[PDB]
Structure formats: C-alpha cells, structure tokens
Design a protein around this ligand. Structure first.
Ligand SMILES: CCCCCCCCCCCCCC(=O)OC[C@@H](O)COP(=O)(O)O
Ligand SMILES: CCCCCCCCCCCCCC(=O)OC[C@@H](O)COP(=O)(O)O
Lengths: 532, 136, 211
C-alpha cells in the first residue's frame, strides 16, 4: 500500500546529497505526491507524516542544505506554495511534526524560519502564511488548534534581524532609550477574524488539546486579555453579576412566600402582597426560560462531544439543569400538582449555589471555585463508590441481624449508619436483636473502616497534588477568564466594535512593494538592564 | 470584655513561638477569612432558603431557625430529622445530604489550598513578620 | 513634550565617548536639566528617570569612563553636588534606578562606590551623603523608604581598602587576633535623629514597600 512512493523520496530520506543531485540531474519530478496509506496521517499506528511531497520530506527531516538545493536548483525549480491532497503545505507539515520538546521545538522553529526566509526571497510578491488548507486552517491556526506551544510561541514573537525581510517578523521595536525599550506585537487574525481567530480557537478547543491551559502564558496573549478585561469586560461582568443577584433575591422572595392552600393554581387576591408575589413569580419564570434558551443556543453552537461534556462546559450544563428544573416546576404547577414545590426548591438551591460562577474575576475566589470544580469532577465518584459500598454492606449486615422494630427497614438503618460520618452516631440506637457482641463488633468495625477510608482519602489527594495546585489552578482560572471574556465580547456585539484591540500604528511604513502597511500593533513596555 | 480578653494575644510577641502562632492567626484572619467565608455563606443561605421553602409550617418555618439548624451540621451536631412538618421526605433528605457533602468538600479544598500554597513560606515568612512586629 | 532635551544627553545615551568629547570641546553645557515630561518620574507609563542631569544619566547608564571624563574634564568641570528640580542628586538617582536584582544590585553598588570615591577625592572638604532633597530624605533614607534592599545592605556594610578614604566607610576592624576579629558599625542617623531615622523609616513604612 506504498503507492505513490518514488525513488526521489527514498534518496532524500537517506540524507544522500550527491545521490539526490544525480537523481534530479536526469530531470526527476519534484511535485509527485505519495498517496500510499503508509504516508497517511493516522491510518494504522505505524507510519510517518511528512506533507506527502519530497520538499516537505526534506524540510521535516533535518536537511536544510537539501531544501536549499531543491528550492534553488537550475534543473527544475521546486514549487514552495504547492498544496498536497490534504491541503497541507510545508508550514503545516512543520507544525504537525512538532511534539513540544525543547530540542524538537528549536529544530522546528529554525527550519520554519529558514523556509520562510527562502520563500520570501524567492517570491516576495506572494503571501505565504495567509494560505489555508482544505480544513481552512492557517499555519498559526493549525498550531493553536493542535496545542503546539513551541511553534505558537515562536510565531507570536518572530523577530528578524537582517534587511529586506523585517516585514515578515511580527515583533518590532518602536525605540530604545537607555535600559527601557518599547515593543510592538502584531495582532492580525488574533482576536477577531470572522472565520477563525487564535483566541477563539484556543478558547473553544476541547480538553484533548495537549497544553490548552499554559498556552495563554504567551506574553502578547496574556497582556491582550488583561487589557480587554480591564477596559470593558470588568464593567460588563459586574453588571451581569448584579443583575443575576437581583434575579436570585427576587426568586427567593417569591418562593419563600408561597401560599399554603393546596391544589394549585391559587387565585390572586386584591392585595399588595399578592401583586408582589405574582410579579416575582413571573420574573423568576421568565429568567428560567431565558437561561433555558441560552443553554440550548450554546449547545447547538458548540455541539460538545458527549465525552468532554462535563469536564468542559461544567457551568453551562449546571445552568441548563437549573432552567430545566424551573420549567418542570411550572409545568407541574399548571397541571394541578403539588410537586412543583419539590422542583422549585431544587431549582432554587441550584441557583443559589451557582452564584459561584461569578467568582471568576477575582483571583483568590476564582482559584477556590476552580479547585471545587476539579474535585467534584475527578475525585467525587472514585472516592464515593468505595464509601457507598462499605456503607451499604454494613447496613445490610446490621439490618439482617436486627429482628424487628422501627429500624428493621434497610433505609432507616442506612440513615443511622451514615449518621456516624457526620459525628452523630449512637452505638445504642436499637435493642431489638440478639448477640450484642456481634452488633457492637459490626458497628466498631464500620467506624474504624470509614475513618481509615477518609484518612487515605485526604492523604492521597494531598500528596498527589500539593505541588500542582501551586500554579495549575491559577492557569485554569486564567483560561476560565479568557472564556468569559470571549463570550462577553461575542454576545455583546450591539455596541459595534467598541473598545477595539489597540490603536493603529505604522511599524515599517513600506513593504517590499511601494504600498504602505499597518498591522494593528499592541504597545508593550519592558526594561532589561543587563545584556545591552 | 470578650474583645479585651482575646486581645491579650498582642503580648505574645516577645516570645518566638507564641509570636509566630499569633502572627499566623493574624495572617489568616486578614487574607483568607473573607474569601473562604463568602462561599460557605452562599452555600448555607441557599440550602437554608430551599429547605425553609419546602417546609409547610411549624417551629422551623422561620428562615433564621432553619439556618441555625443547617449550620449545626458544621459543628458536628446536625440532626437530619429535626422536623416532620413537610411533604416529599425524599426531597428533604436529598437536600440535607447534598448540603453535607458539599460543605465537607468545601472544607477539604479549604485546607488543601491553604496548606499547599503556604507549607513552604511559613518556614521563615512568619518569623520575619514577627521580627518586624517586635521592631515596631 | 521633550522640552529640556539636549544633544549632549543623546550623545551620552549612545555610549559614544569620542562624540561626547567632540561635543563638549566647543563648550557644551553640563548643568542643563531636561524638564520634559518624558523624563519625569511616573507621568505616563513610558519613560525613564535618570536624575534630569547629563552626569546622572551617564552614571545610571553603565558608563564609568564617561563619568570620570565629565568629572575631570579640562574644558568645564562638572558639578557633583548639583541638585535637580526635584532635589535628587546622583546618589538619589542610583537609588531610584535599582530594582533589587543581583546583577543590577552589584552594578548600582559598584557605581555608587566609584562616584563616592571620586567625589571624596575631588572635594574632600564637602560632605556628600548628608545632603537632602526637597522631600528631605537622605540617600540612605530614600533607599530605606523605597525598600531597595541591595543598596541599604551595601551602605550599612561599606568597607574601603585604600588609603585616604577610610573615613567614608561605615565598617571598621578594631583588631584581628588569630581567627577572631572584632568589627565596628557606624550608627549615625540610624536609631534616633529627630528628623528621619532608618529604623523609624523602615518601621512605619506602609506594606507597599517591596521588601
Ligand atoms: C436530583 C439532583 C440532585 C441535586 C439536587 C440539588 C442540589 C445540587 C447542588 C449543586 C450540585 C453541584 C455542585 C456544584 O459544584 O455546584 C456549585 C458551583 O459552584 C459549581 O460551579 P458553577 O458556578 O455552577 O459553574
Ligand atoms: C460586632 C462585632 C462582632 C465581634 C464581637 C466580639 C467577638 C470578637 C472577637 C475578636 C475578633 C478579632 C479576632 C482576632 O483575631 O483577635 C484576636 C487577637 O489575637 C488578634 O490580634 P491582636 O492581639 O488583637 O492584635
């Protein structure tokens, strides 16, 4: 299944410069593609992806001299913009082959720089990076989507120190006075592009992305997010928090003063209190419907994978569940049923406990809520299955021992046994049985076992994470804030392009073509006393 | 009188160990109490409002009494059967159990957080703050 | 808003010794101050503070040779006690520019030592450190107030090992017998001064002080 393989590829692989020159002397083709299954992305665990072109194979295989020879041969010039069947060019292959390792990262960035420089020199009139594959992803977009931290870090901080190619670089130095110099970063296709932006791609990427958390440590991204926040998202978020708090207060007041006559609905009397109760109930139902509709809209827009449904979107799912409880409550209320009380109280508790979603926006409280989320996700089930097994087993044993009476039911005995965990056990809660020794032994064994269980719980989740929580929680909180910022920006387009990324700047003034250019720079200031 | 008796700790400075202890108390009361109490109060108030809404009438129909009973779970004196004047015992039990589990999780991440982030700084930062205190 | 900027400052910044010599050969002024907003303390995030004088700019910019040339030129002697509009001298600028980093700390202490030695040699009759700015803070007091740990640590443990300048140092060795030697530390304006003492300044400083 090696169809499409050519001897030129084999020669290039063997690092044989002279043999490659001899092979291409007769006029060996260079645009031939290897469509064999062995050269595909992931069809079968064995394989190797190299872009399906000989020049891409040379580029990805640590042969810069061969790349130069292929690009600047006098026999048959090698096309640099050629797009393979999957639409991936040299840059796409370089992005793919990276594994986010220091040595490999340095290799890939060096090769990317060299190939970009050669392409610019050969055909300066042709824009290279802006191109897209069949998937419609730019090389920067592809790197961001695949989580290649090194490639993205290099691209966002490109700096070329030789003439006639400064326009390629994304970082420029406006000036340098004394030990302090200002720097400019290019924000083209970063925040808003209407097709795919780096911030949008990184934000909405699934957790399967290797390094989604720390990719925001990049300097321009972090500073841009902070600036956007402090510019307008802080005010918008605070207003939203205030509105939601008013909603929750109104809902609590309406629910607390519910009438007690039975068989709803209830006719409203001509009194001020009844009017206030009715308007509060209407507002609560309206808010519930609004939350339900927003949740449905989000679910259609994003379409989670049903596997990361909980790890990602942990707050939207909870809000949607609260809204569902509200809708069930109203449906039962109009159906002349008295279970709307149960549904309403569940919704009310969920709503009050969902106020933690707004902790993000304050560093400490945000980290606290993030830790709560992480536990509820990845520890609760594992550390609760064991405890429930123990509790159920010992409760079944005790209830089997008991002859008859109030506690002969399994549920009551389970409740009494669970009372030991909250510091209210009895050890003498019944006497209708035989063999008091067996009863006492069972209860003491249960107590000792559950205490041992909790002790290894805490030992485990303290030892395995006392170090990661130092910065991992902060990184997750920063990601959370980024999600909030992007959602707030996209949702509130009513204010047009209010509070744009930055001002308009002229960094180079002239490109190789006579026409001038601007790159929507983002001014940044730093100081470096040493290494002038 | 209570404030005066509890302010005797100001004189612990002058003894290294007791001074460090009082300094740690001060640091917590300043930079952790509000952050770790807002969340707990939100949870407690929400669940108390839910339970009191569920209850029909009786001694515990007031919000304050229900809040007190729910808070009693934190000091190891909860009841889980403190009232029977309501309907849907399943809902009541689920609410109380969820509250208990959530508050225990809350305290566990409390301690994990303030242990992990400062098990190392307290080695000398508290001593330095105590020395500054003594200088003052 | 660069008013007060002079070509001499630009030449000094570019680390051009020969060009500076040519510029000062015609009689370029040295006491001119740059009052432009760009050279102010913190008016606008961009900027850089250097004492508002060319000699202070050279001192803060890692040019010891240029400092020596300016101080001991035969064309126009450079005043070392000159006080700018804000009342900050060379020592005050050196204190300001420190960021409490090992490399920067070593740089600033070395430059401070060199400038102090040169000032002592040029005009030994003039006391230098005791002077105060408009804020009324001595260089040691300024360093303590701003929390510059490195500068204060160096000043409190100054030791000069060449003749005719031992009086400048604050640390002295009374004697040294075997492997044990006694040391003396100068406590002038440290605990009680009636205006501003190092202990008083550090004690009552707000928590905003870095260290
Ligand atoms: C039949 C359903 C059983 C649950 C009945 C109601 C009690 C549920 C209490 C909330 C359970 C979820 C626990 C939780 O973690 O929510 C607290 C929030 O900070 C979570 O983060 P977020 O702000 O909502 O995004
Ligand atoms: C309406 C006011 C509510 C408080 C009513 C009285 C109960 C207050 C108990 C003291 C609250 C402060 C807690 C505290 O930390 O004080 C203990 C001292 O070691 C603190 O350090 P210091 O020696 O006083 O300087």
């Amino acid at each position: 299944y090696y169809k499409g393989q050519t001897a030129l590829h084999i020669a290039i692989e063997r690092r044989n410069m002279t043999l490659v020159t001899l092979l291409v002397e007769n006029g060996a083709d260079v645009q031939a593609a290897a469509n064999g299954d062995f050269f595909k992305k992931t069809k079968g665990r064995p394989g190797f992806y190299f872009g399906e072109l000989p020049l891409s194979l040379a580029a990805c295989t640590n042969q810069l001299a061969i790349v130069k020879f292929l690009l600047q041969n006098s026999w048959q010039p090698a096309d640099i913009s050629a797009r393979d069947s999957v639409g991936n060019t040299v840059l796409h292959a370089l992005v793919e082959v990276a594994d986010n390792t220091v040595d490999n990262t340095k290799f890939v960035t060096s090769m990317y720089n060299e190939i970009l420089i050669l392409g610019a020199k050969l055909h300066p009139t042709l824009k290279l990076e802006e191109i897209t594959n069949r998937k419609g992803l730019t090389p920067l977009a592809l790197a961001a989507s695949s989580g290649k931290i090194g490639v993205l870090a290099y691209i966002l901080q490109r700096e070329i120190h030789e003439p006639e190619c400064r326009h390629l670089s994304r970082k420029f130095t406006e000036w340098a006075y004394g030990p302090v110099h200002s720097s400019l970063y290019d924000l083209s296709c970063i925040d808003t592009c209407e097709k795919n932006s780096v911030l949008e791609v990184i934000a909405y990427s699934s957790s399967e992305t290797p390094n989604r958390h720390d990719m925001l440590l990049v300097e321009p991204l972090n500073r841009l997010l902070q600036d956007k926040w402090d510019r307008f998202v802080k005010r918008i978020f605070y207003f939203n928090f205030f509105v939601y708090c008013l909603y929750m207060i109104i809902f609590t007041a309406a629910a607390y003063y519910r009438p007690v006559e039975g068989l709803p609905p209830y006719k409203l009397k001509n009194t001020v209190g009844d009017y206030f109760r009715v308007t509060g109930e209407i507002l609560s139902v309206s808010g519930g419907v609004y939350f339900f509709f927003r949740g449905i809209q989000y679910f259609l827009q994003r379409r989670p994978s049903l596997k990361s449904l909980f790890v990602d979107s942990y707050s939207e799912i909870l809000f949607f569940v609260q809204s569902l409880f509200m809708l069930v409550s109203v449906v039962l209320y109009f159906s002349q049923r008295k279970e709307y009380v149960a549904s309403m109280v569940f919704s009310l508790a969920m709503g009050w406990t969902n106020m933690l979603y707004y902790t993000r926006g304050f560093q400490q409280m945000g980290i606290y809520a993030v830790m709560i989320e992480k536990m509820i996700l990845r520890d609760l089930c594992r550390f609760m299955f064991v405890y429930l097994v123990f509790l159920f087993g010992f409760s079944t044993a005790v209830v089997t021992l008991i002859e008859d009476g109030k506690y002969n039911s399994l549920y009551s005995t389970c409740l009494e046994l669970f009372k030991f965990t909250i510091g209210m056990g009895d050890l003498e809660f019944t006497e209708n049985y035989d063999f008091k020794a067996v009863f006492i032994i069972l209860l003491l064994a249960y107590v000792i076992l559950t205490y041992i269980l909790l002790l290894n719980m805490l030992i485990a989740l303290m030892g395995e994470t006392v170090n990661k929580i130092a910065q991992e929680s902060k990184n997750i909180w920063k990601l959370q804030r980024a999600i909030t910022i992007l959602d707030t920006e996209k949702s509130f387009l009513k204010c047009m392009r209010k509070a744009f990324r930055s001002g308009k700047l002229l960094q180079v003034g002239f490109t190789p073509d006579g026409k001038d250019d601007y790159r929507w720079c983002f001014r940044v200031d730093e100081v470096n006393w040493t290494t002038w």
